[PDB]
Coordinates of C-alpha atoms and ligand atoms in Angstrom, one line a residue:
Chain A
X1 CA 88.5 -84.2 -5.8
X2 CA 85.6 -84.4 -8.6
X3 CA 85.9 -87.7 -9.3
X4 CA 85.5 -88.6 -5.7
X5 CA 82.0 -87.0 -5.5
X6 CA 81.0 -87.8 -9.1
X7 CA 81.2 -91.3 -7.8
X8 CA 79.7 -91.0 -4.9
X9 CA 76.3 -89.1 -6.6
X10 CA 76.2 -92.1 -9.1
X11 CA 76.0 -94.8 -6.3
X12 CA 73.2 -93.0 -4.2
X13 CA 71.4 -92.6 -7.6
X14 CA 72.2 -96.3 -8.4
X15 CA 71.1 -97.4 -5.3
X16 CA 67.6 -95.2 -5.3
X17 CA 67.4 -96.2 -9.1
X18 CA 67.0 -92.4 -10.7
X19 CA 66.4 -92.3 -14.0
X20 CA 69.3 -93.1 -16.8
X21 CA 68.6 -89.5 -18.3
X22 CA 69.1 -87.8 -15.4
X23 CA 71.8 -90.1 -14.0
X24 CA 73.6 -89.3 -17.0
X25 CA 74.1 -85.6 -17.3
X26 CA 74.8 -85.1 -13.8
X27 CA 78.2 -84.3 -13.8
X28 CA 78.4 -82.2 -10.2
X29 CA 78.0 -78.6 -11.8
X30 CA 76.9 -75.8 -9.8
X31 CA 73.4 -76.4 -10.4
X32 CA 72.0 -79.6 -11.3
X33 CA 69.9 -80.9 -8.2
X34 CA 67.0 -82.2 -10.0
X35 CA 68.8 -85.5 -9.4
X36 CA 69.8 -85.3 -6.2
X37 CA 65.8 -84.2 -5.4
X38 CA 65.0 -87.7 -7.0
X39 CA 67.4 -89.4 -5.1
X40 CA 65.6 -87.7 -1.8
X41 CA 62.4 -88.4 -2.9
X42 CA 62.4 -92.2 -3.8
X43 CA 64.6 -92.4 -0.4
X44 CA 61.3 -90.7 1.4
X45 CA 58.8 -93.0 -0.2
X46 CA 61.1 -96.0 1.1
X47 CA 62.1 -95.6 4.3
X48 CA 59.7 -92.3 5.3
X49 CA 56.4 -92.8 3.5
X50 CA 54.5 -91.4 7.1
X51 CA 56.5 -87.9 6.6
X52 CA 53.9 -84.6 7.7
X53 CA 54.4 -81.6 6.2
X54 CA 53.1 -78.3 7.8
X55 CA 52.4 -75.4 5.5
X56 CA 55.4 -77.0 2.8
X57 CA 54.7 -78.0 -0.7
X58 CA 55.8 -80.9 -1.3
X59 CA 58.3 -80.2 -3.9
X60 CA 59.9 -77.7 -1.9
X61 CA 60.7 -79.8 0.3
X62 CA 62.4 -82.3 -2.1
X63 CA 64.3 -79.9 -3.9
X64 CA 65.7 -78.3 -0.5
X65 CA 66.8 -81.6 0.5
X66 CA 68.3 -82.0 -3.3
X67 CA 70.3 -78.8 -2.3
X68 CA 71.4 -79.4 1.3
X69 CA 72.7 -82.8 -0.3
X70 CA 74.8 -81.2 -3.4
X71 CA 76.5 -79.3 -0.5
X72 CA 77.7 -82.4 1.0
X73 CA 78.8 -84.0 -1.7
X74 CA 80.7 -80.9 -2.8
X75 CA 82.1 -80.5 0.8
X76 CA 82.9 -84.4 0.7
X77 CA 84.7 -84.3 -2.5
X78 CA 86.4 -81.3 -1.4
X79 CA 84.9 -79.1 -5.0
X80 CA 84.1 -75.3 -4.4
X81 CA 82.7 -73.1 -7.4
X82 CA 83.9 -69.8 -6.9
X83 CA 80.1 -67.9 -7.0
X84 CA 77.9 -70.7 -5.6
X85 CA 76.7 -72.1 -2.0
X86 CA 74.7 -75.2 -2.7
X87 CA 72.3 -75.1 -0.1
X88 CA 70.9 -71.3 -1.1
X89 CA 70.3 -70.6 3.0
X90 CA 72.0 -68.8 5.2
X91 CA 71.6 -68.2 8.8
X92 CA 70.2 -65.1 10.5
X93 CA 70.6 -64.5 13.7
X94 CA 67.0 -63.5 14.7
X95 CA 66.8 -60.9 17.3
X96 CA 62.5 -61.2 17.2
X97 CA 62.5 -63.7 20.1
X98 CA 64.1 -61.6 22.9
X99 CA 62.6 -58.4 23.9
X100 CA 58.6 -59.0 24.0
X101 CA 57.1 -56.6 21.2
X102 CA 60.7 -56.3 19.7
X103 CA 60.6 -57.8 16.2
X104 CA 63.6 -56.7 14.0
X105 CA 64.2 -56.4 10.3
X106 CA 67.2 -57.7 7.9
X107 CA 69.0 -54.8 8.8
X108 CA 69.0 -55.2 12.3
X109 CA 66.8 -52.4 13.1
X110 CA 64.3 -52.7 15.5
X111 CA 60.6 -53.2 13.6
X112 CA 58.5 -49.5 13.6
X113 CA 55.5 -49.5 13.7
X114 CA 49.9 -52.7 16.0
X115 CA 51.2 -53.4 12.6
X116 CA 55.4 -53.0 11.8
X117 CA 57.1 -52.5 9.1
X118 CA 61.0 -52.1 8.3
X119 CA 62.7 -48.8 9.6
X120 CA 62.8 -47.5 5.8
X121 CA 59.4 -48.0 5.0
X122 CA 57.6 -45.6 7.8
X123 CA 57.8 -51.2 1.4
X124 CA 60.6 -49.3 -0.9
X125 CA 64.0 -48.0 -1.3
X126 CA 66.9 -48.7 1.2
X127 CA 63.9 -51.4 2.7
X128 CA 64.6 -55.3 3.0
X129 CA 61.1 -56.6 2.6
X130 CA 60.6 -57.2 6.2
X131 CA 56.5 -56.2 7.0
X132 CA 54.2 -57.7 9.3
X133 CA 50.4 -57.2 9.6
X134 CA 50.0 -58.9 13.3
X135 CA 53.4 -57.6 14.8
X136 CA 52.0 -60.2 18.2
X137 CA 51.3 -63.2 15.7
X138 CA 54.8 -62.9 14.5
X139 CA 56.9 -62.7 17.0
X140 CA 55.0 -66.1 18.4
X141 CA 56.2 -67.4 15.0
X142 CA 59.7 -66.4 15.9
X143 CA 59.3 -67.8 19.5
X144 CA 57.7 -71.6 18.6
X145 CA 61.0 -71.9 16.2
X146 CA 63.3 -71.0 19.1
X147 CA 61.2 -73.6 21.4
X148 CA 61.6 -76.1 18.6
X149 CA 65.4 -75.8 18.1
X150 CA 65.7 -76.8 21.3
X151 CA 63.9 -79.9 21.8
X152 CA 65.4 -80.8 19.1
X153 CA 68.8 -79.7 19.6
X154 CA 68.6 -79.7 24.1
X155 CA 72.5 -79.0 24.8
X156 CA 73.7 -77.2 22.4
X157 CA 76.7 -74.2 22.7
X158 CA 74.8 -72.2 20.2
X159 CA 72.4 -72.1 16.9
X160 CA 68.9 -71.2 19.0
X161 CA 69.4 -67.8 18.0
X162 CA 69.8 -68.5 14.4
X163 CA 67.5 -68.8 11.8
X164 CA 68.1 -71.2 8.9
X165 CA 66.3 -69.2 6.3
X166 CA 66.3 -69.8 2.7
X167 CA 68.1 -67.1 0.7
X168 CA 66.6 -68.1 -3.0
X169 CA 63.3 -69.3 -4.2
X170 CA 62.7 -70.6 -7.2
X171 CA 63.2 -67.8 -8.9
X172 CA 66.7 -66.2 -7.7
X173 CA 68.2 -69.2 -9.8
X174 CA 68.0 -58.7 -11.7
X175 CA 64.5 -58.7 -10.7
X176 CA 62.2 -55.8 -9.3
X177 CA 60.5 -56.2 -6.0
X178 CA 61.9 -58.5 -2.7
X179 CA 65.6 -59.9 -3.5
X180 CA 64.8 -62.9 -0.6
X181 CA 61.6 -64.9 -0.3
X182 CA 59.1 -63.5 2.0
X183 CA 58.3 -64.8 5.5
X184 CA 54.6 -64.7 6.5
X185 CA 54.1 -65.8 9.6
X186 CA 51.2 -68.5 10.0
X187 CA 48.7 -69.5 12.7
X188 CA 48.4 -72.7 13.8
X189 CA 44.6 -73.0 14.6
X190 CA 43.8 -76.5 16.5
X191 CA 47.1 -76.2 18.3
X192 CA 45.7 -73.4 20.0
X193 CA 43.4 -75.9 22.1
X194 CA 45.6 -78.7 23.6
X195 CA 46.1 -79.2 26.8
X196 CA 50.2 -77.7 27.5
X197 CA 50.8 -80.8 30.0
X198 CA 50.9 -83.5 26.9
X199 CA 52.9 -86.5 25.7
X200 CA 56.5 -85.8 26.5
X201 CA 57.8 -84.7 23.1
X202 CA 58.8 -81.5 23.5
X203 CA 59.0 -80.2 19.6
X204 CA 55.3 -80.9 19.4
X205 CA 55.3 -79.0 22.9
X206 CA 57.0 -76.0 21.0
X207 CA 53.8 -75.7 18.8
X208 CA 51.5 -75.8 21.4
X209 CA 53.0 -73.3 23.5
X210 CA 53.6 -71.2 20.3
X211 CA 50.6 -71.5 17.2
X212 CA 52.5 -70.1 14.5
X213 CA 55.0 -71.0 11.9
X214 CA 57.3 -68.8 10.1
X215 CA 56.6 -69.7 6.2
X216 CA 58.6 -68.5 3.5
X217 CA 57.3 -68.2 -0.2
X218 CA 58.4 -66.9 -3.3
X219 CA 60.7 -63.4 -3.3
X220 CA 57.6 -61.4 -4.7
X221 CA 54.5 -63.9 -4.2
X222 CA 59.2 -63.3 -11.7
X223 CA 57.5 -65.7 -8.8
X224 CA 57.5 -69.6 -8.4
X225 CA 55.1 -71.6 -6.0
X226 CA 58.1 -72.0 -3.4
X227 CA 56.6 -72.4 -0.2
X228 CA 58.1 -74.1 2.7
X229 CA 57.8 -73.6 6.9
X230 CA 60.7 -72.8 9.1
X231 CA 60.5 -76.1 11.3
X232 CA 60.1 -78.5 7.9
X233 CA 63.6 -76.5 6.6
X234 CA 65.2 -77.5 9.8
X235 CA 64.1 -81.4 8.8
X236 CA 64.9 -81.5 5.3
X237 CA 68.7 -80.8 6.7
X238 CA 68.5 -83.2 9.4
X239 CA 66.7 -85.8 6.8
X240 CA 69.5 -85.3 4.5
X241 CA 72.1 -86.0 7.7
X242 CA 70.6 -89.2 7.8
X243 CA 70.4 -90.3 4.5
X244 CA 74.3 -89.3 4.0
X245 CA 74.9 -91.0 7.3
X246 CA 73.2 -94.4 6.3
X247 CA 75.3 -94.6 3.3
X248 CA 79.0 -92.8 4.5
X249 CA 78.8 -92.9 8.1
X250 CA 80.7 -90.1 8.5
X251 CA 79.4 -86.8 7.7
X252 CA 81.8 -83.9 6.5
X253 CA 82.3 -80.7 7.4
X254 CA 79.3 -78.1 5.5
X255 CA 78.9 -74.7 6.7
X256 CA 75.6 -72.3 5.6
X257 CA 76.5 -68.7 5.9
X258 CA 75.9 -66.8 8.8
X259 CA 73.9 -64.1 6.9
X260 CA 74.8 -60.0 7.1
X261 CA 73.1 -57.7 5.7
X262 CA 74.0 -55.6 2.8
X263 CA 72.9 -53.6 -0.2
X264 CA 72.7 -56.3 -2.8
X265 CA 69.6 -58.0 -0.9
X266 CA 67.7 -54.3 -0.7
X267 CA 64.1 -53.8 -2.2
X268 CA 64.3 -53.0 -6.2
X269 CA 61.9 -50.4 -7.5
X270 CA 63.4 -49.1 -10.6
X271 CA 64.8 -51.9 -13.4
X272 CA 68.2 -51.8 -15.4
X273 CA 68.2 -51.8 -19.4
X274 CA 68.6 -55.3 -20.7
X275 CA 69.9 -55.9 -24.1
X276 CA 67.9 -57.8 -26.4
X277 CA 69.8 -59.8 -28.5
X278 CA 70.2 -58.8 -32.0
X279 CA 71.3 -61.4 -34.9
X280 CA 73.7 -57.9 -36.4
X281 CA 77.0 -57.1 -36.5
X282 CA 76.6 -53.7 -36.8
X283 CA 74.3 -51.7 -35.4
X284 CA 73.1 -49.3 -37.9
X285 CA 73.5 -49.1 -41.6
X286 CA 74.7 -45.9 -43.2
Chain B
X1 CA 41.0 -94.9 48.5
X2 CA 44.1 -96.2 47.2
X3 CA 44.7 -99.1 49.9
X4 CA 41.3 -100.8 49.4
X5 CA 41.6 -101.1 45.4
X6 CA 45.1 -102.2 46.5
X7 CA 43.7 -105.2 48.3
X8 CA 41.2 -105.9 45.9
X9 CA 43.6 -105.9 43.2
X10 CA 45.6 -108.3 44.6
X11 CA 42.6 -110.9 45.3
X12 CA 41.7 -110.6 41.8
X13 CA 45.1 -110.9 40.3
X14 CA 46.5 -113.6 42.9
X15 CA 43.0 -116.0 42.6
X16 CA 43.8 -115.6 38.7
X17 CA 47.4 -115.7 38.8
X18 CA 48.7 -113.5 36.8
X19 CA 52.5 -113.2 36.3
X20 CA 54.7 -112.1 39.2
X21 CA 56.6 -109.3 36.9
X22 CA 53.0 -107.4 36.2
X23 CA 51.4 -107.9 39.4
X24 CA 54.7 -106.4 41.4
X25 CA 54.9 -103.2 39.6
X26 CA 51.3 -102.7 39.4
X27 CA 50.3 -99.7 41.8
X28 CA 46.9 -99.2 40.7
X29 CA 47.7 -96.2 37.7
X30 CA 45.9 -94.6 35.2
X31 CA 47.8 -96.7 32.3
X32 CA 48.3 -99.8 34.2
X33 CA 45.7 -101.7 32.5
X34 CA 47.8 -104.9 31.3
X35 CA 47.7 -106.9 34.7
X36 CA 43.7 -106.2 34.9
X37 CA 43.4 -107.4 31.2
X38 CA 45.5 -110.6 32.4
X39 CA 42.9 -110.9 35.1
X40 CA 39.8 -110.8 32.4
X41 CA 42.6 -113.5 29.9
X42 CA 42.6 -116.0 33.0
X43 CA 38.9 -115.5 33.7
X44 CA 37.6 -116.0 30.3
X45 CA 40.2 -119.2 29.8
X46 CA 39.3 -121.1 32.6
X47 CA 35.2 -120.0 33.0
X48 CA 34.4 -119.3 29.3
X49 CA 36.5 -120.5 26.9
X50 CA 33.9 -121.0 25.0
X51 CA 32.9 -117.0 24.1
X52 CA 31.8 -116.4 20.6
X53 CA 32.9 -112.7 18.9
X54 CA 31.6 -111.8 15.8
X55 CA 33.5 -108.6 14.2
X56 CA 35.9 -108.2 17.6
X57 CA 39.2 -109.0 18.3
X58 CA 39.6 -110.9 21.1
X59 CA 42.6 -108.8 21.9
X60 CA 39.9 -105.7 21.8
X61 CA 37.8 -108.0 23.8
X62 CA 40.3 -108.5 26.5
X63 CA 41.5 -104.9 26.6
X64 CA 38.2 -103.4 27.1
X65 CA 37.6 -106.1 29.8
X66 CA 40.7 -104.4 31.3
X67 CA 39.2 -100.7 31.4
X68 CA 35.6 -101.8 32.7
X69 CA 37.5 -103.5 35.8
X70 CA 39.9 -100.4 36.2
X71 CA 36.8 -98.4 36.4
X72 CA 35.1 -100.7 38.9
X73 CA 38.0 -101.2 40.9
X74 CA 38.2 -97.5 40.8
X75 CA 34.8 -96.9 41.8
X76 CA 34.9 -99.5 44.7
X77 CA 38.0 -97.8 45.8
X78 CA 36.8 -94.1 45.8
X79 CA 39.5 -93.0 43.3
X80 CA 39.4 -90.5 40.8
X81 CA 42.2 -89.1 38.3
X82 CA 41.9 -85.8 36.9
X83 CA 42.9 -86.3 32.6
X84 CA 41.5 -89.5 33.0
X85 CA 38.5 -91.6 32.3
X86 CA 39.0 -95.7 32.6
X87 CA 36.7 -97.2 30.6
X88 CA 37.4 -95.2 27.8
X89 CA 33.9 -94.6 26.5
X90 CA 31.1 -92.6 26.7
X91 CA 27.1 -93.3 26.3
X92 CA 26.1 -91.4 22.7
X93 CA 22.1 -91.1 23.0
X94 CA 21.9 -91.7 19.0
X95 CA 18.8 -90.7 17.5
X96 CA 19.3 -92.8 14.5
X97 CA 16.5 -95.1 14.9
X98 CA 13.7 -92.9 15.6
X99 CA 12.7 -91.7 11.9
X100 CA 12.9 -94.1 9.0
X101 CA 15.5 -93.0 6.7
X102 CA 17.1 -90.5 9.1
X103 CA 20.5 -90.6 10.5
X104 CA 22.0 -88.1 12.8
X105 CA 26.1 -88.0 13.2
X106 CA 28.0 -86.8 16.6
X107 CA 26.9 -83.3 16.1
X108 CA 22.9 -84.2 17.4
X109 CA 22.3 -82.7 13.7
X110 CA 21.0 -84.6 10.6
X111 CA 23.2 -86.0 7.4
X112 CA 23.5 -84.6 4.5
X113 CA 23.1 -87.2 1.5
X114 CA 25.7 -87.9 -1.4
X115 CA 22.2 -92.5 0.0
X116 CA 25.5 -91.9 1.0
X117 CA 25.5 -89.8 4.3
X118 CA 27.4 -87.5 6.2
X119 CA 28.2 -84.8 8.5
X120 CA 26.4 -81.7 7.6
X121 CA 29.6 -79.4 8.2
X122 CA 31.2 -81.7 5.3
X123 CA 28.2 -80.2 3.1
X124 CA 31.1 -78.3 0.9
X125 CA 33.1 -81.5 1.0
X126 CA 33.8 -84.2 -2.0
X127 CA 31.3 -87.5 -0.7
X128 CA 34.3 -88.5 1.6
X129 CA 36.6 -86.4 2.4
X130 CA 36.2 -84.7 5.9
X131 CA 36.1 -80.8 6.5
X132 CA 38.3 -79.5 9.9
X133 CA 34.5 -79.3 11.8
X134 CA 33.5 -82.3 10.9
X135 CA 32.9 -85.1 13.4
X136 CA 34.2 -87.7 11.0
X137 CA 31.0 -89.3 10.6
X138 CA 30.3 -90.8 7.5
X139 CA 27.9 -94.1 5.5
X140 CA 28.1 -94.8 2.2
X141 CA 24.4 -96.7 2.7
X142 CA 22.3 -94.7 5.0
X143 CA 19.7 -97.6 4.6
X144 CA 22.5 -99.9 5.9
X145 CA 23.6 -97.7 8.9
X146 CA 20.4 -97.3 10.4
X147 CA 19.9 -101.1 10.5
X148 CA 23.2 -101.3 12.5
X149 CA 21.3 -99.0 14.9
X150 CA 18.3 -100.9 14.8
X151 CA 19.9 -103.9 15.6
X152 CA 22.1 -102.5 18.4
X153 CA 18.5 -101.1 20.3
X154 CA 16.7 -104.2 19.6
X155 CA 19.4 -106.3 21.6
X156 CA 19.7 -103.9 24.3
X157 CA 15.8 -104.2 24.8
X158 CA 16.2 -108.1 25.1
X159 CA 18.7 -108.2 27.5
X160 CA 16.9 -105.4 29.8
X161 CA 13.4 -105.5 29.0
X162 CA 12.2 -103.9 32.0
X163 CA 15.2 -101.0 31.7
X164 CA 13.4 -97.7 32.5
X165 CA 16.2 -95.4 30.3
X166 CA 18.8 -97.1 28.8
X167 CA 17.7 -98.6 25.2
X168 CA 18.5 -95.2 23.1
X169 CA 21.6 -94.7 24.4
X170 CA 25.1 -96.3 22.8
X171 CA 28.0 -97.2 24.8
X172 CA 31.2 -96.6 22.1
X173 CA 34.7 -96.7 22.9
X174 CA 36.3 -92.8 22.4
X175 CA 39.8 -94.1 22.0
X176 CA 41.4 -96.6 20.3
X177 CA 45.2 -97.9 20.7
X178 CA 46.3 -94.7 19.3
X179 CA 44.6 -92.2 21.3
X180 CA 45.4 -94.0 24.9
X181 CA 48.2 -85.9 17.8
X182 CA 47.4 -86.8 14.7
X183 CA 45.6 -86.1 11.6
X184 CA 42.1 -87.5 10.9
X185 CA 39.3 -89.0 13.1
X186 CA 39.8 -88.1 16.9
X187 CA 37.6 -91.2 17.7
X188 CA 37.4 -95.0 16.2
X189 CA 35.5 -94.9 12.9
X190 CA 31.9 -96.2 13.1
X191 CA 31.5 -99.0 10.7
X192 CA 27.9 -100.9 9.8
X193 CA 29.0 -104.0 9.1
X194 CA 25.9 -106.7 7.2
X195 CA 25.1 -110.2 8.6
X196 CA 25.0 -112.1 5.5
X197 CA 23.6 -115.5 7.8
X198 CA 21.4 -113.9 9.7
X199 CA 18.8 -113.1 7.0
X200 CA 18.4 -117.0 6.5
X201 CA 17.4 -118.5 9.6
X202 CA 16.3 -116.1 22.4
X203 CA 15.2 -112.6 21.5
X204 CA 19.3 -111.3 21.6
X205 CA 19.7 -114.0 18.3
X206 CA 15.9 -113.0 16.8
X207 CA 17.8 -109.1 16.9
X208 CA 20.3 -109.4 14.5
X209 CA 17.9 -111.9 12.3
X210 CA 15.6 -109.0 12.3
X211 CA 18.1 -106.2 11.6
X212 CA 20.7 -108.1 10.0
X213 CA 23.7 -105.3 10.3
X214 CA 26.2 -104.5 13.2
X215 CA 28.3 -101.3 14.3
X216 CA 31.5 -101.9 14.5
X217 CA 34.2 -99.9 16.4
X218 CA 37.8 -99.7 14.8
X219 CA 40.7 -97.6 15.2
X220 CA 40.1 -93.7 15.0
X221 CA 41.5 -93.8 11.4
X222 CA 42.2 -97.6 9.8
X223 CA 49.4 -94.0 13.6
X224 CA 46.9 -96.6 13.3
X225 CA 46.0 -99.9 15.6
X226 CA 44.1 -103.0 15.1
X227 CA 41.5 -102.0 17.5
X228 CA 38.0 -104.0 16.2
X229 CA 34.8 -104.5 18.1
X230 CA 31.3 -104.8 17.8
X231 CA 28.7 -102.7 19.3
X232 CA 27.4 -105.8 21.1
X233 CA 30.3 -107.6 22.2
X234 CA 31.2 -104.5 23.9
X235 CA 28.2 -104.6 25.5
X236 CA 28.8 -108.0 26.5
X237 CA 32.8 -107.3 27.8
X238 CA 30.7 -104.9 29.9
X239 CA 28.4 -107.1 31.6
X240 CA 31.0 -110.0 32.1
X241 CA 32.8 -108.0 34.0
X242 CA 30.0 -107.5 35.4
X243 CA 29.5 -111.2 36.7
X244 CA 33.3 -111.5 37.3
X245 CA 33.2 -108.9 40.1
X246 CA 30.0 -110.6 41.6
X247 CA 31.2 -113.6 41.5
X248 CA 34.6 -112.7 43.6
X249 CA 32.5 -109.9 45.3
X250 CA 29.5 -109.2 47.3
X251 CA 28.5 -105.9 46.3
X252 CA 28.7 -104.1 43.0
X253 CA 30.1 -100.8 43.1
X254 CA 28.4 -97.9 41.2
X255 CA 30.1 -96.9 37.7
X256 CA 28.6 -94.0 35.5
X257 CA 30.4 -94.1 31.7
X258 CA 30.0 -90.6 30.3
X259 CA 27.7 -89.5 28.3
X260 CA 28.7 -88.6 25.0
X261 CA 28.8 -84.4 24.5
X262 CA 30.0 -83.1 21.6
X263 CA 33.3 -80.9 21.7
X264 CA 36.1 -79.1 20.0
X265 CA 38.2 -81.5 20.7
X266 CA 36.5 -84.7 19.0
X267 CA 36.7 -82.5 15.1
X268 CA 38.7 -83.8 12.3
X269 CA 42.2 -82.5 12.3
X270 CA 43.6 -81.5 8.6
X271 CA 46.4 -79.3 9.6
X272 CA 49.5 -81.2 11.6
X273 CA 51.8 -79.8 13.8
X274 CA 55.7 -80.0 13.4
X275 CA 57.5 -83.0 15.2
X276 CA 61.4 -83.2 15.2
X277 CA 63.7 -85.7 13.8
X278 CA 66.8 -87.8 15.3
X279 CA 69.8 -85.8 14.8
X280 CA 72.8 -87.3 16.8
X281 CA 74.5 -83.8 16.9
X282 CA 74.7 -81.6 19.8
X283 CA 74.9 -78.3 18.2
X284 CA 72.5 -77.8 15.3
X285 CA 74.9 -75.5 12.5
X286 CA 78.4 -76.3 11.6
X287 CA 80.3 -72.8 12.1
Ligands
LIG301 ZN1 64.8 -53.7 7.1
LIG302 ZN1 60.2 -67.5 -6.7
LIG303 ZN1 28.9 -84.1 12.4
LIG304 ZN1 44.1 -96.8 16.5

């Protein structure tokens, strides 16, 4: 049912006055969010103007909420385009948090090796992107998310495991080098010296227990400035929740991918011939 | 000793009466500091109701009245919590009024100027924005500042002119409403603040007439609180405490406030840390 969710777009956008130019070429195609991003953002600056961001642009975070709210609209109005998820994540179930020294790659392959690298890179070929320079700084990263999931989310039947990873930057919207945007893991510095037996919130406990936050950037930091943490990913869904709840009450039904790996996301060294265009009907003249 | 702060609690609290909801609850805690604030209210209402504040809140006033009785009580009581300091402040032995012109922030190290002054591990900074060692310190008029200091020694030395060590050190709160984490200041922002009147007029008044600027205490970064005080006011809620525990009691109990070391943990936070949101699901991914 277009109609359904063309309608409801133009209200929020009413509501959060967007601009008439933008309000009126929306018309719920696969890829206009640059509205939707407006509509978060003006929402923000009203009723969230104290919002912290760790290692996130700003933007980033905006235009993920843009795209985690085009999914609902489309799953609300019940509209699917046959080669297009709307939030660009998917969610990988990260093994990195189990085993202690055990990181593992995309593929599901245990991380070789005081550095670690992907299976196929003892980064080219059959690889998936997955390095790390610190392999003990990064499985804290994958750790503090884990710790984090769950004070936010205490009984829960499952999702812990997973990670909700973004599956296309900026860019991804062929082209050599990483086909997903890279994760560095990052330290978190004064975290490291606060007493563990704090104020009762338990995220914030997560942090302290775990100084470092998975970041992912641009594919191949062509590239974009796409930068965003794990733990301000997880918000800008649960921000958009909200904002859809406020208006609708009740939220419908949105799945992200469980992601499995495959071919198509593998490390690309050598290009493919492009055609450039030529304004000739035929191609020689004889 | 936990019983004999117990009965002395109850003097104070019945004597003054305070309200039977705060008082019957009250088992002499860390963070009960509400009924002992009442106590200071009462006190002050019907013994001094006529108390001048310049700069202060008297909710600041009242509150800090609160913490230097928890920390007697405490004191006359024997009893000591471990994460926890009741008066909430620490003596800083300033050396900003020993060399004309010079300033020194929490470090024990000089300023830096931009007259503006500030914290020599801000030397990379823009005038007023803080670096992650900083101490937070900073005066746009250095000139200005060290009056405020000036002022501050000159009124300790009237009201203990015989004190053998006392009149270079500065008792300032550490925490404000907030920190009783977050980004910026880890301690209320030190403030000189100019006495316009003064300059056109007992030795405490001939003070600020002859350093006519105070230091004021408010919150850590103006979360955020309305946590206001001068530096001699809370001298002042000290010593009336002071008198209000002679007054119902024979002896005075010893009570040290800390002396101000500098730490890790008092440096400008610029990097935050990643606090949850409300999300009235159980499980976190739709499947
Ligand atoms: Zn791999
Ligand atoms: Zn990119
Ligand atoms: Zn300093
Ligand atoms: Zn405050």
């Amino acid at each position: 049912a277009w109609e359904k969710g063309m309608e409801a777009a133009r209200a929020l956008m009413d509501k959060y006055h967007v601009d008439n130019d933008l309000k009126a070429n929306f018309k719920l195609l696969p890829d206009q969010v640059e509205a939707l991003a407006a509509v978060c953002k003006t929402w923000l600056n009203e009723e969230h103007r104290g919002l912290q961001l760790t290692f996130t642009s700003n933007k980033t975070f905006v235009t993920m909420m843009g795209r985690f709210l085009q999914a609902y609209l489309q799953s609300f109005a019940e509209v699917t385009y046959k080669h297009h998820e709307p939030t660009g994540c998917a969610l990988w179930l990260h093994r990195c948090a189990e085993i202690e020294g055990e990181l593992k790659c995309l593929h599901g392959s245990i991380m070789i090796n005081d550095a670690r690298c992907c299976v196929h890179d003892a980064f080219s070929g059959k690889s998936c992107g997955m390095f790390f320079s610190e392999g003990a700084k990064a499985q804290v990263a994958f750790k503090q998310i884990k710790a984090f999931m769950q004070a936010l989310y205490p009984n829960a039947q499952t999702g812990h495991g997973h990670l909700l990873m973004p599956l296309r930057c900026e860019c991804n919207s062929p082209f050599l080098g990483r086909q997903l945007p890279k994760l560095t893991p990052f330290a978190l510095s004064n975290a490291e010296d606060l007493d563990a037996d704090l104020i009762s919130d338990k995220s914030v406990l997560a942090s302290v227990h775990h100084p470092a936050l998975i970041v992912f950037q641009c594919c191949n930091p062509p590239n974009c400035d796409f930068k965003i943490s794990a733990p301000d990913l997880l918000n800008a869904l649960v921000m958009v929740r909200s904002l859809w709840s406020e208006n609708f009450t009740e939220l419908p039904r949105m799945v992200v991918p469980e992601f499995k790996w495959s071919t198509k996301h593998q490390y690309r060294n050598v290009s493919l011939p492009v055609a450039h265009s030529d304004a000739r009907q035929n191609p020689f003249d004889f």
